[PDB]
Design a protein around this ligand. Sequence first.
Ligand SMILES: Nc1ncnc2c1ncn2[C@@H]1O[C@H](COP(=O)(O)OP(=O)(O)OP(=O)(O)O)[C@@H](O)[C@H]1O
Ligand SMILES: Nc1ncnc2c1ncn2[C@@H]1O[C@H](COP(=O)(O)OP(=O)(O)O)[C@@H](O)[C@H]1O
Ligand SMILES: [Mg+2]
Lengths: 468, 466, 480, 53
Amino acid sequence: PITGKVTAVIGAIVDVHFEQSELPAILNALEIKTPQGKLVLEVAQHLGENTVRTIAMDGTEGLVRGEKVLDTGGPISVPVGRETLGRIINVIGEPIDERGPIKSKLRKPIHADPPSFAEQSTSAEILETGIKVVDLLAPYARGGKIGLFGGAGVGKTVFIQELINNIAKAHGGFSVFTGVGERTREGNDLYREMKETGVINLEGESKVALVFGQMNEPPGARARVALTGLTIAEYFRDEEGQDVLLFIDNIFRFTQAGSEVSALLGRIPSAVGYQPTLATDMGLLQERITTTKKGSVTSVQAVYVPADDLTDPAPATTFAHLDATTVLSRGISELGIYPAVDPLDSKSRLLDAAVVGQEHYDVASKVQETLQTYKSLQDIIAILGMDELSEQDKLTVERARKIQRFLSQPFAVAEVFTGIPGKLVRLKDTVASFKAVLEGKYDNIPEHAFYMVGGIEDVVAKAEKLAA
Amino acid sequence: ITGKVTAVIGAIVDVHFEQSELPAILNALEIKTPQGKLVLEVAQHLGENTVRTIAMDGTEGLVRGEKVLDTGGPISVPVGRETLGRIINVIGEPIDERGPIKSKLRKPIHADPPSFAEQSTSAEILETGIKVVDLLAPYARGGKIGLFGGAGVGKTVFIQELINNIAKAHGGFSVFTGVGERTREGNDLYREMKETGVINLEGESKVALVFGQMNEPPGARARVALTGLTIAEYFRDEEGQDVLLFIDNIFRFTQAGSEVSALLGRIPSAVGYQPTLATDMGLLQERITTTKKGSVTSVQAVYVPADDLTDPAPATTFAHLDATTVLSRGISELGIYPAVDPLDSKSRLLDAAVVGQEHYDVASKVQETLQTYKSLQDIIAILGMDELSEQDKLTVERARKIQRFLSQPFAVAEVFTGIPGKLVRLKDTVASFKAVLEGKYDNIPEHAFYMVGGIEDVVAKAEKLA
Amino acid sequence: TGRVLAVGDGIARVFGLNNIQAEELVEFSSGVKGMALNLEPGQVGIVLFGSDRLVKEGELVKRTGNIVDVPVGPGLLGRVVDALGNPIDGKGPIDAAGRSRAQVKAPGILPRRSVHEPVQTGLKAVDALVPIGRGQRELIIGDRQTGKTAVALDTILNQKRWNNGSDESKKLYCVYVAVGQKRSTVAQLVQTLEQHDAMKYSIIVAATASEAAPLQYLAPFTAASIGEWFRDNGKHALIVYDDLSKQAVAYRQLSLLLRRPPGREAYPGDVFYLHSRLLERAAKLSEKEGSGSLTALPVIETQGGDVSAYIPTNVISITDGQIFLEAELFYKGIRPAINVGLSVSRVGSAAQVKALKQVAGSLKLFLAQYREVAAFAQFGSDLDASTKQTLVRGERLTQLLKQNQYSPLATEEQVPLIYAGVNGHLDGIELSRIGEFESSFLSYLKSNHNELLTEIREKGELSKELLASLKSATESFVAT
Amino acid sequence: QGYAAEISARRNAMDNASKNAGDMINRYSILYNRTRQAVITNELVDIITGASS
Ligand SMILES: Nc1ncnc2c1ncn2[C@@H]1O[C@H](COP(=O)(O)OP(=O)(O)OP(=O)(O)O)[C@@H](O)[C@H]1O
Ligand SMILES: Nc1ncnc2c1ncn2[C@@H]1O[C@H](COP(=O)(O)OP(=O)(O)O)[C@@H](O)[C@H]1O
Ligand SMILES: [Mg+2]
C-alpha cells in the first residue's frame, strides 16, 4: 500500500504529503482511521513538493499533523447491484440503516465518464409512467431529466413512490433515491413512508435503493452524494439493461455544495457567488444520465428556485438540462384532484408531433386548449353563471370540468392510506380516453363519474353504477 | 525600553525593538518631534521583534530609524474632578490652553467591562421634558439612549436641548465626547455651555469635555471615545457618582475602526466595514453600564448614512440601546420638528409595570392611531379622504391632530424659529394626549396643535386663531 | 509546547505544537486560552478567547490535550454559564454529570422518530395556528425589536405548569443561549425568570457582546451539547438560540481574521454548514434510542425585513418552519405581532393538541379569508354581505389573538376562547371590549364550569358531549 | 341611465388599470431580480479584490 501523512488541517480541507512518485491521482479516496471509523479525503489538487490538497467527507476535528493516510488507489468506490435495494447508503458507500454490511459482489467508482457520442441514442422517445396527466400533457423522456416542482402538502412523496412503483411494474426497472443535502427528518419520514407503502420491504424484495447525504454533512459529501446515487443507478443500466429511475432531492443543494467546496479551495467565486465551475460541474452529473444501447437512466430532480428567481444561475443552469417539468400545485390539491399535477404549468420538450405521434399531439393540444379556455372563462362563469355564456362556451366549460376531473388517478401506493384500489393506465388507453372525451362521445356522463378512475372503461362502469 | 521606526505608510508605523522585550498590544509609544510628542498605539506583533502601530497624529515628517520610547502601558488620560470644565484630546492632553491638568491620577483608556455579577438593573424613568420622547419612548437612567438620524434631520439641536434639560438638572457630573464630529459644532457647544454656566472658568463646573474632531487621524477618532469613557468610568467607580456620558458621534467610532482596519490590511467585511465591527462596538458599549457602585447614563447620537438604518453600523448600534429616538427626514419635511419617528422610536421602559397603565394606554393608542393613519395614507393619496368611512375619517383627523401635537419648540431652536421654547412635563403630556385621543378637542383646528406646548397651549392658540 | 510567532486581531500564530489536534484548546503563559483552528505545515493559527493584549511574541504556549468541550448534566439547572461552562452568576461551582464535546454528529436517519408531541407555547397564536412539536426546530424570524425574545421567553415561562410535576416524560427543560447580547439584557432575563420561578428548570449559556468572537461562535454548539444530555438520557429539552445572526457574524470575524476565503456578504463559504451542523442536532429519538428529544427555536433578525439575505435564507432552508414577526402589526397593537400568512409549521398539525386541533382547524380558514378581504374595509359604503360578515368575524378573531407579555395561557384556557371566537359568539360584542370578554369568560368558567376545564386538561380531547357542554357554557356566559 | 353607465365604465377602467399594474409588476420584478444579482456580484468582487492583495 501507499501511505502519506497529514500536514495541514484547515476546515474541511486537508493537505497530505507523500513520498516521491507515490502521489495519488486527483479524485482518489484516502482513508484515515479514527475512533468514529474511516474518514475519507478526496484528492482535489496537486500542490507540488509531493503534496496534495483534499476535501474531507467527514469532520476533520481531531486530526493531528503527521496522522498517516492510506491511499485506496481509486475514486470513492460504492457498492452496486440488487444487494443495495432497500438499503440506506452514505456518500462513501457505507450502510447507515444498521442492517449490517451491503454484501454486493461489485463496487464501482463514483467518478466515471459519460457515454461516448457514438453510444448515444439517435432518437428521443417517451417513458410512460402509467400516470394519465403526466403521460398525456407532460410525457417523460426515456433517459432524460425531469424537473419536479412543489413542496410540502402537495403529495410529492407519494407521487415519487408511485413513479417508483409504476416504473418497476411496467418496465421492470429498479430505482435509486438520492437525498442531496435535505433534512434528516424528511429522510427518516421518507424511509418510514416507503416501508409503509411497500416500495421498501425488509423481509422480501424491494424496488428502491436509498442514498442520503444530509444537511449536517460537510460540503464535500453533499457534493458527491449525487454521484454516489448516480453510480448505483448506472450499474442497473449498464449491467442489467434496465430503464432505471434516479430521484435527486434537491439538485439546488448539489449546486450549493459545489459552491461551498469551490469557495473552500480558494477559487474566485463567479457571478452572484456561485462556483466558477458551475456549468461543467453540473454537466459532469447530468450527462451521465442518458439512454444507451442497453438501457437508460431517467432522472427526476426536485429543483428549488432561490428568491423565486428563475434567472438565477443555479436554476438557470439546471433548466438547460431538463427535458420536462412536473409542477405539483397546492391549488390543484385544494380542488381535490390528486396527484395534483398542474395541467398547464407542467411542460415537456417531447410533446411534439414528431416524437409522440400526431394523434397523441392533437389530443394533448386540444386538452390544453380546453383547460386554458376554461381558465380564461372562470371569472365570468362565476359572475354570470355558466348559462350566461354561449352554447359553445357552455359546452366547452362542461367538457373542461369533466376532463379536469378525469385527470385524477388513484395511486397503488396511496391505497394503503385510503383503501381505494390503485390504477396504472398505459398511454394508448389514456390517449384513446381523452380523444373520446374531446369528441363528445361521453358528454352525457355526470362529472364525478370521471373522478378517481382509470381509463374510459372505468368511466363507463362508474357512470353505470351511479345511474343504478 | 526603546526601539526604532522602520516603516511609515500613512497612519501605520512599524517599529523594531532590538532589546527583545516588545511592548504589549495597545501600549502607547512616543516619538519626539518638533510638533511635540507623536503617540503611537501598538496594534500587532509581526514577528522578529517588529510591532505595527497606529499613529494618533500626523505621520508626515517621520524618518526611518527614528527612536521610539515605550510608555509601559496603554494611552493614559487624567481622571477625577480636576478635569471638569476642561477640554481634552484623545492622548489626554489639554487643548483649552489653560495649562496642565492637575489630576492626582492618570488611568489607561483600555479596561475590562464589568463582569456579569457586577451588573445592576434599574427601571428609573428619566423625564426629558419632550412630549414625543416622554410619551412614546421614555429614557432610562443608567441606560443608553440613541439619537439616530441622517444629515440635517436635527441630531445636534436635539442633543443640545437634551443637554439643556438634563445636564442642568442632573446632580452628577457629566462628560461629553466629540468623537470625530465637526469642529464648528463643537465650538458652538463649548460657547453655549460656557454661556449657560454648565462650564465655568472660575470655581466649580460640572461637565468635562473630550474632543477628537474629524480632522484627526483614524486612530485618534477611534480612541477618543474610550478617552471620554474612561473619565466617565472614574466618576462611576472611584467616586460613586451617577454619571451622564453624552457621546456624538458613534458612527465616527465605527467609521474610524473601519479605516484603521483597512489600513492594517484586514480583509474588509460587508460594505467595507471591519471584521471586528460587532466586538469593537461591544467593547465600547458595555463598559458603559450601571454597576452596583453607580450609574452611567449615556446619550448617543448616531449618524445614519444615506438614511439607511439597515447599514451595518446603525444595525450593530441598535442592539446595545435601551431607548431609541429615530429622527426621520420624512417627518421633518412635513415640518413636524423635532421630527422623531413616533413608530420607529422604541423604549425598553414603555411597560405598564414601569410607567403605569394610563401612560402605557395613551402611548399604545397613539401608536395605533398613527399606524392606522399611515396605512390609510396609501389610499388617501389616490382617492383623498372623501371615500373613507366616517370612523376612518374621524381616526385620520385625530391622527393628524396627534401627529402635529407631537411637535415642540425647543429653546435651542430659537435661531431656527422665533417661537419661545417650552418644556412639557410627562404627566401633562399623558393628560393632553389622553384628552386628544378621547376627542374632547375634535372641535379644534389642526393648526392649533402645531409647535405648541401642552394642551393648554392648544386651547390658547385655537382661541388666538379664532 | 509552542512559541508564539505573531499576534494580532485576536489571532496568534504559534510555532511547534506538533501533536496538537484540530480545534484543541491551548493555554498561554498569561493564562488566556485559545483553540487551534488552523493547522499548517509550520505553524498553528490559534483564535484567542481573551483580548490579544494578554499574548505577545515569544510567549510559551501549553497544549491542553482536550478538544473544546463543556460540562453537562442536571447540575447546571438554574445556573448561568459562559460558552465554556464556567459559572458567571457568581454562585458555587458547576456540579456536572459529565463533559461532552461542543461539536458532535447529529442523530442519523434511523434513530429518529416523527415528531408527535406538543411544545406548549403559551401563546394563543403560536399554539393554535403554527404549533411546535417536541423535536421540531422552529425559526423565530423578524425585524429589530419585534418581540422575538418575548415569544421565546413566553414559551420558556409556560413550562412552569408541568415542570412542577413528577412525570419526567412531560417535563421540558429549557436552555437559553444569549449570543452578542449586552450583559445587562442577560441579567434582566435572569431576573425575569427568577421572578416567575422559572430558573429552577432553565439554563442560560451567555456569550455577551464584549466576549471574544470564538466564544460567541461556540456558545450555540456548547449549549446544544448541554441540551443533548437531556435528549440522550430520555428527557425532553428546549434550546433557544438568541440569536444565530450574531453567531454568523462572529464566525465571519474568525474566518476573515484567519484570512480564509470569503463568500457572499463576506461570510465564509461554508456558513451554511455552520447552522446546519448546529440545528440538525434537534431530534426526536425513537423508543430504542431513549425516546428523548431536543426542540430548537433559533432566533433570526432580518434587516428591513429582507428574508432574501444570505443567513436568513440558510436558516429558513434548514428549519422545519418559521414564526414570522412583523413590525407593522406590532405598531397596530397586534402583539405578539405574528404574521399568520408567512408563519408556517411544516410538521404542523401532527404536533398539535387534539382538543385545540378540533377547534382551531377553521380559525386558519377564517383568518385567510379575512386577509384576502381586508382591503375592503376602506370601502365599507358598499360591502357584499359575505365580505361584511367575513370582516366582522376576522376583526374579532385578530383582536382575540392579542396577548400580554409574560402571560401564557393553559391549553384548556385557550380552547374555550378560540371556540367562542370561531363559532361567532363574539359577533354581538363590541370590538373595543373583546379584551374584557376573554379575561371575564375564563374567570366565569373557572368558577361555573371548572369540570369542563379539568376534563379538557386531563383528556386533551373535546368529546361530542363535552363539546356540547362547552357550547352551552359559552352561550350561558355571552348572555351576560 | 348616466349613473348606470358611469358605474359600469368605472368598473371597466379599474379592470384595465389592474391589468396594466400587473404588467408593470412583472417588468419591475424582472428588473429587481437583475439588480439583486448585480449587487451581489459587485459587492463580492469588492471583497475578493480586498482579499487578493
Ligand atoms: N405581547 C406583547 N405585549 C406588549 N408588549 C410586548 C409584547 N411582546 C413584546 N413586547 C414589547 O416589545 C418590545 C420588544 O420586545 P422583545 O425584547 O421581546 O423584542 P426582540 O424582537 O427580542 O428585540 P431585539 O431585536 O432588541 O432583541 C419590549 O418593549 C417588549 O416589552
Ligand atoms: N426644534 C426645531 N425647530 C426647527 N428646526 C429644527 C429643530 N430642531 C432641528 N431643526 C432643524 O435641523 C437642522 C439642523 O440639524 P442638525 O442637528 O444640525 O443636523 P445633524 O442631524 O447633522 O446634527 C436645521 O435646519 C433645523 O431647521
Ligand atoms: Mg431579543
